[PDB]
RNA sequence: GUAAUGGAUAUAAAGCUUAUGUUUAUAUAUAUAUAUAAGUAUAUAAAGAGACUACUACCAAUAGCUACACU
């Protein structure tokens, strides 16, 4: 049984695990993305 | 209001696709022999010359003109 491609990232495409580029504001590094399939279906049944 | 030709704020990454250099021996055996030694040319001439076209010359064919001085 494989995994849905939208759920995970290919393990072999990741690298060191830390970010090599500098950021001016650490607050801009945060953003909440949706991962609930049920919540995604609540939008299609509307639109 | 002013600034950006490598702007700005985020995002991803890792044994080398750098506009840069120097070097380049066969055979045999467990030193001897041979004599420059990585290999390569589906790349590279113009002292002069050929062909085609054009220009400048020379030349006077073709064409036009001249007969009571030709027939
Ligand atoms: Mg004539």
CA A16 to chain CA centroid, Å, is: 18
The CA-atom distances, in angstroms, between A41 and each of A2, A9, A34 are 22, 22, 12
> In the structure, how far is the CA atom of residue A4 from the C1' atom of nucleotide B45, in angstroms?
69
To one decimal, the resolution in angstroms is 3.0
Question: Cα of A9 to ligand 1 centre, how many Å?
Answer: 100
Distance CA A37 to C1' B68 in A: 127
Angle formed at CA A8 by CA A6 and CA A12, multiple of 5 degrees: 125
Nucleotides of B under 7 A from a protein CB: 8-14
Q: From CA A29, how far away is CA A23, in angstroms rounded? A: 8
CA separation for the pair A1, A31 (Å, rounded):
31
């Amino acid at each position: 049984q494989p995994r849905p491609r939208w759920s995970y990232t290919p393990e072999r495409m990741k690298g060191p695990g830390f970010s090599l580029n500098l950021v001016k504001d650490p607050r801009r590094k945060q953003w909440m993305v949706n991962s609930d399939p049920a919540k995604l279906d609540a939008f299609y049944d509307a639109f």
